Amino acid sequence: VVAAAEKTGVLYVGSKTKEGVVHGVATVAEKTKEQVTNVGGAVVTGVTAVAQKTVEGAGSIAAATGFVKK
Amino acid sequence: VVAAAEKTGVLYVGSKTKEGVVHGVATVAEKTKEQVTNVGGAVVTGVTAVAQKTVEGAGSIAAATGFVKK
Amino acid sequence: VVAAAEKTGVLYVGSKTKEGVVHGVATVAEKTKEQVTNVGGAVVTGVTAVAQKTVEGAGSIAAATGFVKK
Amino acid sequence: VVAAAEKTGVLYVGSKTKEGVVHGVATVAEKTKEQVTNVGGAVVTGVTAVAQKTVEGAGSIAAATGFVKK
Amino acid sequence: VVAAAEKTGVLYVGSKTKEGVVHGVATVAEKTKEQVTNVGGAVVTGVTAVAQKTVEGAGSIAAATGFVKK
Amino acid sequence: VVAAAEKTGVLYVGSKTKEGVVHGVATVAEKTKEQVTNVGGAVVTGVTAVAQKTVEGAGSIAAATGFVKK
Amino acid sequence: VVAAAEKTGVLYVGSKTKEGVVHGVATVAEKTKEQVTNVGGAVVTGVTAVAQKTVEGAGSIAAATGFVKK
Amino acid sequence: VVAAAEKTGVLYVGSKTKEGVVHGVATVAEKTKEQVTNVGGAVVTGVTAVAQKTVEGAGSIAAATGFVKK
Amino acid sequence: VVAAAEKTGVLYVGSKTKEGVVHGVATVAEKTKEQVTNVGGAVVTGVTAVAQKTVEGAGSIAAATGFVKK
Amino acid sequence: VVAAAEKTGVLYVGSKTKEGVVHGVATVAEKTKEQVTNVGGAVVTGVTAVAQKTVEGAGSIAAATGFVKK
Amino acid sequence: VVAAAEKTGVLYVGSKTKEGVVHGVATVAEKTKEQVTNVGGAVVTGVTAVAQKTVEGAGSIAAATGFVKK
Amino acid sequence: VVAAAEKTGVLYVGSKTKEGVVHGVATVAEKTKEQVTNVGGAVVTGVTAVAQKTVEGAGSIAAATGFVKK
């Protein structure tokens, strides 16, 4: 990701990179009702405007696993 | 991520990088109701405007695991 | 992440990096109701405007684990 | 992260880095109600405007674990 | 993180770094009600505008563990 | 983190670093009510505008552990 | 607009009226461009989420009149 | 607008009226550009979330008149 | 606007009125640009979250008149 | 606006009125630019969270008049 | 605006009135730029969280008049 | 505005009135720039958290008039 300029009216050199980006979000919630009953499991709810970048590893967003037995 | 300029009217050289970025979020909540009953498990709720960058490791956002038994 | 300039009207050289960044968030909550009952488990709720950068380690935001038994 | 300039009207050289940064947050809460009942577990709630950078270690924000038994 | 300048009208050389930084936060709370009942567990609530940088160690913000038994 | 300048109108050389910094926070609370009942556990609440830098050690902010038994 | 109840499990009597009401609006604008050149006239633009109730009078929203000559 | 109740488990009597009301609005604007050039006229722009109730009079929102000559 | 109750488990009598009311507004603006050039006229811009009630008079919000000549 | 109660478990009588009221507003502005050039006229800009009640008189919010000549 | 109670477990009688009221406002501004050049006119800018009640008189908020000549 | 109670467990009678009231405001400004050049006119800027009640007179907040000539 390099930018190089050599001069010997306007000169512009640009490199832009976006990875894992969230922008420009508007939400309205009125009179909403939510009930969760969980017995021995996993519940994930209500996830909004989330950004993540991972290098050399697993990347998980809003992941639910009931249980692991070994 | 380098920027180099050599001169021997306006000269601009630029490199920009965004990784795991959240911006520009507006939320309104009115008269919302939420009930959670959890017995021996995991519940995740209401996650907003979260950004994360991870190098050489696992990256988790809003992760629920009921239980682990070994 | 380097910036270099050599001159022998305006010269600008710039490198910018953003990793794990949250900005520009506005929230309004009116007359909201929330009830949590937890028995022997894990509950995570109401997480907003959180940023994290991790190097050579696991990175977790809003993570719930009911219990671990070995 | 270096900046170097050599001259032999305006010369500007700049390097900027942001890692784990939160800025520009406005919140209003009116007449909100929250009840938590916890018996032998873990509850995390109401986390806002939190930034963290970790090197060579695990990084956790808003993490709940019910209990650990060995 | 170095800045170097050599001259043999305006010359500016700059390096800026931000790691684990929170700035620009405004909050208003009116007539809010909060009740917590905890029996043998852990409860964390109401965390705002917190910044942390950790080197060669675990970094935790708003972490709840019900109990540890060995 | 070094700054070096050599001259043989305005010359400026600067290096700035911020790690674990909180600034610019305004909060208003009116007629808020909070009740905590704790029996044999741990409760943490109401944490605002906290900054920490740790080297070669664990860094914890707003951490609750119900109890440890060995 | 009256509500009357007489008792000699649940009894509910209700009258609700809404006149000139706007609610539940979410808008996002990114990279928009707007140019207005006006010479001796009237220009109205960009009107959103406006509510009005008028009794015994004229009610105008987003009204433009170039000029009036008598 | 009256509510009357006479008793000789739950009894509720209610009258609610809303006139000229705006609620629940979320807006995000990023990188918007606006230019206005006005010579001897009237320009109105950028009006959001406005509510008005008028009795025995004219009610105007976002009204532009270039000029009046008598 | 009256409420009357006569008793000779729960009895509730209520009258509520809202006139000219704005509530629950969240806005974010990033990198916006605005230029106004006005010569002998009137310009109104950027009006948000405004409420007004007028009795026996004219009610104007965001009104522009270039000029009046008599 | 009257409330009357006569008793010869819970009895509640209530009258509530709101006229010209603004509440629950959150705004964030970052890197915004505004330029105004005015020659012999009127400019109004940047009006937020304003409430007004007027009896037997004209009520104006964000009103611009270039000039009046008689 | 009267409240009357006569008794011959809990009895509550209440009348509440709000006229021209602003409450619950949070604003953040970062790196904003504003320039005003005015020659013989009127400029009004940056008005926030203003409340007014007027009886038997004109009520003006953020009003600009270039000039008056008689 | 009267409250009257006659008794011949808890009895509460209450009348509350708010006119021209501002409460619960939080503002943060960082690195803002403002320039005003005024020649023979009027400029008003930066008005926040202002409340006013006027009886039998004109009520003005943030009013600018360039000049008056008779």
Side-chain angles (χ1 to χ4, degrees):
Chain A
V1 201
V2 317
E6 298 173 307
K7 159 140 54 154
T8 299
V10 176
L11 207 175
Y12 172 112
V13 180
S15 311
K16 310 175 110 164
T17 295
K18 292 151 90 114
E19 314 170 68
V21 168
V22 172
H23 63 101
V25 186
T27 62
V28 178
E30 306 198 276
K31 302 198 190 203
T32 55
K33 295 216 227 311
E34 175 163 5
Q35 315 198 5
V36 175
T37 303
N38 176 50
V39 180
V43 175
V44 181
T45 190
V47 189
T48 311
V50 177
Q52 161 162 92
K53 156 118 203 251
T54 310
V55 183
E56 268 166 18
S60 320
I61 301 187
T65 304
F67 62 86
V68 185
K69 211 175 307 253
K70 328 240 179 145
Chain B
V1 201
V2 317
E6 298 173 307
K7 159 140 54 154
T8 299
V10 176
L11 207 175
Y12 172 112
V13 180
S15 311
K16 310 175 110 164
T17 295
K18 292 151 90 114
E19 314 170 68
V21 168
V22 172
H23 63 101
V25 186
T27 62
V28 178
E30 306 198 277
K31 302 198 190 203
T32 55
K33 295 216 227 311
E34 175 163 5
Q35 315 198 5
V36 175
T37 303
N38 176 50
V39 180
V43 175
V44 181
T45 190
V47 189
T48 311
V50 177
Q52 161 162 92
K53 156 118 203 251
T54 310
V55 183
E56 268 166 18
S60 319
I61 301 187
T65 304
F67 62 86
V68 185
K69 211 175 307 253
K70 328 240 179 145
Chain C
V1 201
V2 317
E6 298 173 307
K7 159 140 54 154
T8 298
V10 176
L11 207 175
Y12 172 112
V13 180
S15 311
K16 310 175 110 164
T17 295
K18 292 151 90 114
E19 314 170 68
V21 168
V22 172
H23 63 101
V25 186
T27 62
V28 178
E30 306 198 277
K31 302 198 190 203
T32 55
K33 295 216 227 311
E34 175 163 5
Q35 315 198 5
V36 175
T37 303
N38 176 50
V39 180
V43 175
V44 181
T45 190
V47 188
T48 311
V50 177
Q52 161 162 92
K53 156 118 203 251
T54 310
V55 183
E56 268 166 18
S60 320
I61 301 187
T65 304
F67 62 86
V68 185
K69 211 175 307 253
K70 328 240 179 145
Chain D
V1 201
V2 317
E6 298 173 307
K7 159 140 54 154
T8 299
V10 176
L11 207 175
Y12 172 112
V13 180
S15 311
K16 310 175 110 164
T17 295
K18 292 151 90 114
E19 313 170 68
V21 168
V22 172
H23 63 101
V25 186
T27 62
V28 178
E30 306 198 277
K31 302 198 190 203
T32 55
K33 295 216 227 311
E34 175 163 5
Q35 315 198 5
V36 175
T37 303
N38 176 50
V39 180
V43 175
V44 181
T45 190
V47 189
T48 311
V50 177
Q52 161 162 92
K53 156 118 203 251
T54 310
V55 183
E56 268 166 18
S60 320
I61 301 187
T65 304
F67 62 86
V68 185
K69 211 175 307 253
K70 328 240 179 145
Chain E
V1 201
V2 317
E6 298 173 307
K7 159 140 54 154
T8 299
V10 176
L11 207 175
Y12 172 112
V13 180
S15 311
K16 310 175 110 164
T17 295
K18 292 151 90 114
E19 314 170 68
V21 168
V22 172
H23 63 101
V25 186
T27 62
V28 178
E30 306 198 277
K31 302 198 190 203
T32 55
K33 295 216 227 311
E34 175 163 5
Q35 315 198 5
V36 175
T37 303
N38 176 50
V39 180
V43 175
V44 181
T45 190
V47 189
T48 311
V50 177
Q52 161 162 92
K53 157 119 203 250
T54 310
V55 183
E56 268 166 18
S60 320
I61 301 187
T65 304
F67 62 86
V68 185
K69 211 175 307 253
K70 328 240 179 145
Chain F
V1 201
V2 317
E6 298 173 306
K7 159 140 54 154
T8 299
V10 176
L11 207 175
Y12 172 112
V13 180
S15 311
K16 310 175 110 164
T17 295
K18 292 151 90 114
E19 313 170 68
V21 168
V22 172
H23 63 101
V25 186
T27 62
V28 178
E30 306 198 277
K31 302 198 190 203
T32 55
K33 295 216 227 311
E34 175 163 5
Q35 315 198 5
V36 175
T37 303
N38 176 50
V39 180
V43 175
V44 181
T45 190
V47 189
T48 311
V50 177
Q52 161 162 92
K53 156 118 203 251
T54 310
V55 183
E56 268 166 18
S60 320
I61 301 187
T65 304
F67 62 86
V68 185
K69 211 175 307 253
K70 328 240 179 145
Chain G
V1 201
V2 317
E6 298 173 307
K7 159 140 55 154
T8 299
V10 176
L11 207 175
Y12 172 112
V13 180
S15 311
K16 310 175 110 164
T17 295
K18 292 151 90 114
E19 313 170 68
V21 168
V22 172
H23 63 101
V25 186
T27 62
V28 178
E30 306 198 277
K31 302 198 190 203
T32 55
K33 295 216 227 311
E34 175 163 5
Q35 315 198 5
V36 175
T37 303
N38 176 50
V39 180
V43 175
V44 181
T45 190
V47 189
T48 311
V50 177
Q52 161 162 92
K53 156 118 203 251
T54 310
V55 183
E56 268 166 18
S60 320
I61 301 187
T65 304
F67 62 86
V68 185
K69 211 175 307 253
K70 328 240 179 145
Chain H
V1 201
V2 317
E6 298 173 307
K7 159 140 54 154
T8 299
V10 176
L11 207 175
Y12 172 112
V13 180
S15 311
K16 310 175 110 164
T17 295
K18 292 151 90 114
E19 313 170 68
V21 168
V22 172
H23 63 101
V25 186
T27 62
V28 178
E30 306 198 277
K31 302 198 190 203
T32 55
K33 295 216 227 311
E34 175 163 5
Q35 315 198 5
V36 175
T37 303
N38 176 50
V39 180
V43 175
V44 181
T45 190
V47 189
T48 311
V50 177
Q52 161 162 92
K53 156 118 203 251
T54 310
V55 183
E56 268 166 18
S60 320
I61 301 187
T65 304
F67 62 86
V68 185
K69 211 175 307 253
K70 328 240 179 145
Chain I
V1 201
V2 317
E6 298 173 307
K7 159 140 54 154
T8 298
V10 176
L11 207 175
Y12 172 112
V13 180
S15 311
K16 310 175 110 164
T17 295
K18 292 151 90 114
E19 314 170 68
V21 168
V22 172
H23 63 101
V25 186
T27 62
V28 178
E30 306 198 277
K31 302 198 190 203
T32 55
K33 295 216 227 311
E34 175 163 5
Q35 315 198 5
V36 175
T37 303
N38 176 50
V39 181
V43 175
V44 181
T45 190
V47 188
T48 311
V50 177
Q52 161 162 92
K53 156 118 203 251
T54 310
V55 183
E56 268 166 18
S60 319
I61 301 187
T65 304
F67 62 86
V68 185
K69 211 175 307 253
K70 328 240 179 145
Chain J
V1 201
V2 317
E6 298 173 307
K7 159 140 55 154
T8 299
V10 176
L11 207 175
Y12 172 112
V13 180
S15 311
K16 310 175 110 164
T17 295
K18 292 151 90 114
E19 313 170 68
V21 168
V22 172
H23 63 101
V25 186
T27 62
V28 178
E30 306 198 276
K31 302 198 190 203
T32 55
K33 295 216 227 311
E34 175 163 5
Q35 315 198 5
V36 175
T37 303
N38 176 50
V39 180
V43 175
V44 181
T45 190
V47 189
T48 311
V50 177
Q52 161 162 92
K53 156 118 203 251
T54 310
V55 183
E56 268 166 18
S60 320
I61 301 187
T65 304
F67 62 86
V68 185
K69 211 175 307 253
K70 328 240 179 145
Chain K
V1 201
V2 317
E6 298 173 307
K7 159 140 55 154
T8 299
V10 176
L11 207 175
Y12 172 112
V13 180
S15 311
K16 310 175 110 164
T17 295
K18 292 151 90 114
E19 314 170 68
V21 168
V22 172
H23 63 101
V25 186
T27 62
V28 178
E30 306 198 277
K31 302 198 190 203
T32 55
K33 295 216 227 311
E34 175 163 5
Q35 315 198 5
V36 175
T37 303
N38 176 50
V39 180
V43 175
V44 181
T45 190
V47 189
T48 311
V50 177
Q52 161 162 92
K53 156 119 203 251
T54 310
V55 183
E56 268 166 18
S60 320
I61 301 187
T65 304
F67 62 86
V68 185
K69 211 175 307 253
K70 328 240 179 145
Chain L
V1 201
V2 317
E6 298 173 306
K7 159 140 54 154
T8 299
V10 176
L11 207 175
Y12 172 112
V13 180
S15 311
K16 310 175 110 164
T17 295
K18 292 151 90 114
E19 314 170 68
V21 168
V22 172
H23 63 101
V25 186
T27 62
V28 178
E30 306 198 277
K31 302 198 190 203
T32 55
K33 295 216 227 311
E34 175 163 5
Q35 315 198 5
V36 175
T37 303
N38 176 50
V39 180
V43 175
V44 181
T45 190
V47 189
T48 311
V50 177
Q52 161 162 92
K53 156 119 203 251
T54 310
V55 183
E56 268 166 17
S60 320
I61 301 187
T65 304
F67 62 86
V68 185
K69 211 175 307 253
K70 328 240 179 145

